[PDB]
Amino acid sequence: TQLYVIVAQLFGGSHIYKRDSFANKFIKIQDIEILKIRKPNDIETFKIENNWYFVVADSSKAGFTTIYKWNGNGFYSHQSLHAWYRDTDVEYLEIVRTPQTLRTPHLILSSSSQRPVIYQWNKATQLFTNQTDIPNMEDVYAVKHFSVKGDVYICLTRFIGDSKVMKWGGSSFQDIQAMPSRGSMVFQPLQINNYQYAILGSDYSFTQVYNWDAEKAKFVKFQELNVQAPRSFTHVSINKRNFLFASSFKGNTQIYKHV
Amino acid sequence: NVEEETKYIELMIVNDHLMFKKHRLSVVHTNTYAKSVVNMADLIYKDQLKTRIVLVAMETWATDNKFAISENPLITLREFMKYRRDFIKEKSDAVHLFSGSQFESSRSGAAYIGGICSLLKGGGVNEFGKTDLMAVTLAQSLAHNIGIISDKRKLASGECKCEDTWSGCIMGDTGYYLPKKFTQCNIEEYHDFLNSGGGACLFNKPSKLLDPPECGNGFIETGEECDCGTPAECVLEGAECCKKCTLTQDSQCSDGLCCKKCKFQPMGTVCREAVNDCDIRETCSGNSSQCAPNIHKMDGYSCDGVQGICFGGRCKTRDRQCKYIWGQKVTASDKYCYEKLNIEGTEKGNCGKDKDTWIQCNKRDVLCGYLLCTNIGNIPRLGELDGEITSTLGRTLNCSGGHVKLEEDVDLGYVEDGTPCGPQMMCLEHRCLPVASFNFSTCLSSKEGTICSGNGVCSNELKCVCNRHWIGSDCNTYFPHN
Amino acid sequence: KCPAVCTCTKDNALCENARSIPRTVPPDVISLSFVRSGFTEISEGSFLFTPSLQLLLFTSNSFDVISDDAFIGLPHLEYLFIENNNIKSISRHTFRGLKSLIHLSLANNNLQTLPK
């Protein structure tokens, strides 16, 4: 019941603020290291084995992607992963690999002009190891996963290059569908009212809404919205109502109640 | 002035085979890709630096890499520069390598600081990346080559900072979100470098480009009799001179300082005042619209009676060495420290860099040993400290020195080669040696032991530039004229 | 400047719906965006204003008549995209003057013929 919000700034480094459950005030619980964290790009947080770990990537190539404990640690406390290369985006997911019978955690590290990297949360090493590459193409911007009928489907998204929704199969993924990119710096899947949707932005078109076809197993064009410079989509469900926030880098953030 | 004049940096790009294979083995794609990157960097530089980067030529290796390719940016940069010295001969202000081998360092591209307009230093290496990414890397590397670097002392003191506080500036580590504005200290370093005489080869307009004849591109190229640019900006400069890449009835120019109001200016006008004593004033030829070619004092000419020497148009003194290495407030110490520390001492006075057994310096000359300055600050403007800054204390002087390094193997902590020790006595290999060690050439002279028949100064091209009313090549005949 | 009927922004000419060719484009914009165009005639050289422009989209239109050498004056244009524009026929001499063009798209335009 103690929120540790990661407030990251492109200048002056980043901090971790603690929200007291009583005073509702955000006190800096941990001034995170700024020697490597200068221009943060994306942070991914997750809990596994009762250990809270969050991934930090720097928009600059000097700051290397690293995983840190909830309390906060140093440069390469438990693992180093991707370094001396591009660090752009990271996404945490759970997929069943061929060797391991049960569900296996992973990270996907997408980088500019660099092949995306799969990272298995190997329990033997207890680390996000096994730096590999997807067989699809180069220079993928963003990644996010979801589960349709147990089968994992994930997005490999490029700003202009045709993005992909692709199915997991145990060792690598298997292609499912490809959709055009018309200014989609982000393409986020969502599940609202048990309905699997996905939103692709459009810096140069009208943002597109896909619904997972229950018959064709492909994301058909469901709807077309217009939002100023979409960058992320985030959904809430309170009581019997659902709402969705569409970020805006160059304007006002859009809000849509799912009805 | 010279700063306000439009600089033209003749850049040539060397491309390895890694990105050639990554670009599906396509020559034309790589050519247009380099053209786009050059245009993007020129758009970056036009806003403030007023410098156009002309892509004079470009070479891409469709076969394979000629020399050894390593992930070390320094070793790869050295290999590229030595390959340029061995094979590349065409005139180009900068020679930049697009490194397909993505460097395993934290810095984007490796370029020498202030190394432009040099045969063994004029350029750098930029690693593989996105179009915008390597465009930014090339901009940073070319800023490095022109002496524009992020000021560490001012960063620590907060004297000047990035005005694009949103995503930082270009000079720092290349974030994903590129900025659009350079700091004012970048421009200040540019004026300091140009006034020092460095970057003197950036003031020539190439007649041949990789771009086909395009009307209004800002350069008078082949097939274009005149070029004032796009008529949108042609109103301010060269309105009546050239129109639509064509002359306006009776005309003789399109742009240029040597041609005021679209007409030839009187003979003897100075189209470029000398930045310092190392520079020679340039006078228009009387029939050329563009200013005279940049000419500086030949390498070895002293900035003053004895002290200081002009190398490549840049003045070099012990005080200037301390200013470049440590800071403006830092000045060279007196001969007291030179004779009391370089004679004997560890980390305080040393001729050669030998940690185990320091090289002894003789009492005949001590001005090429450990570089000793006065009031050295906490950190130098550029470089790194090999350990700690050396401090040593009837007159009392605050005596100091250091081991400032660079991206090259050369150590800036010692006295740079060519710093005067006396009459024709200058540093070579951390020792005072005569001119015969450097084997400086003799300009066109007729008398004995004189330069250009005594009266007159030889330019950097080993050609005499005689004084006023001296038309002879070797300054021997007087031709009055009005 | 930035047309009111268009949804043009600071960094783009994001035209939602234009009655015809907008010749009021400033050189400030770096890209173009046309969707659901009402006029049926692709005009000729309507962007003789900024060769530095790079991008434009044509989505779900009916350009049954298209100018030869269409939209001339953009040698640096490289993002040429037409999608869903149901077009009866294309003028033969339409793709000229584009010497630095990299990406093309002719999607859902329902063409049955293409000239030599």
Author numbering:
A (entry chain D): 293 to 551
B (entry chain C): 233 to 625, 630 to 718
C (entry chain B): 41 to 156
Provide excerpts from the study:
LGI1 is a 60 kDa secreted neuronal protein that consists of the N-terminal leucine-rich repeat (LRR) domain and the C-terminal epitempin-repeat (EPTP) domain. Meanwhile, the S473L mutation of LGI1 causes epileptiform seizures due to reduced binding to ADAM22, which is a member of the A disintegrin and metalloproteinase (ADAM) family and acts as a receptor for LGI1 in neurons without protease activity. The ectodomain (ECD) of ADAM22 consists of a metalloprotease-like domain, a disintegrin domain, a cysteine-rich domain, and an EGF-like domain. As such, the LGI1–ADAM22 complex maintains normal nerve signal transduction through the interaction network, including synaptic ion channels.
In this study, the 3D structure of the 3:3 LGI1–ADAM22ECD complex was determined at a nominal resolution of 3.79 Å by cryo-EM single-particle analysis. LGI1EPTP interacts with the metalloprotease-like domain of ADAM22 to form the LGI1EPTP–ADAM22ECD complex, while the LRR domain of one LGI1 molecule interacts with the EPTP domain of the neighboring LGI1, thereby bridging three distant ADAM22 molecules in the 3:3 complex. Like the crystal structure of the 2:2 LGI1–ADAM22ECD complex, the LRR and EPTP domains of LGI1 are linked by a two-residue linker (Ile222–Ile223) in an extended conformation. When the three assembled LGI1–ADAM22ECD complexes were superposed with the LGI1EPTP–ADAM22ECD structure as the reference, all three LGI1 LRR domains were oriented differently. Although the triangular shape observed in the 2D class-averaged image suggested (pseudo-)C3 symmetry of the 3:3 complex, the determined structure of the 3:3 complex was not symmetric. We then analyzed the interdomain motion of the three LGI1 domains (assigned to chains B, D, and F in the deposited PDB file) in the 3:3 LGI1–ADAM22ECD complex by the DynDom server (Veevers and Hayward, 2019). The LRR domain of chain D was rotated 69.8° around the hinge axis compared to chain B, and the LRR domain of chain F was rotated 69.0° around the hinge axis compared to chain B. The LRR domains of chain D and chain F were also rotated 70.0° around the hinge axis relative to each other, suggesting that each LRR domain rotates approximately 70° about the hinge axis in the 3:3 LGI1–ADAM22ECD complex. On the other hand, the density of the disintegrin, cysteine-rich, and EGF-like domains after Pro445 of ADAM22 is relatively weak in all three molecules. Using three orthogonal principal modes, the 3D VA indicated two twisting motions and one stretching motion of the triangular-shaped 3:3 LGI1–ADAM22ECD complex (Animation 3–5). This analysis also visualized relatively large motions of the disintegrin, cysteine-rich, and EGF-like domains of ADAM22 (Animation 3–5), suggestive of intrinsic conformational flexibilities of these domains, likely resulting in lower local resolution in the periphery of the complex.
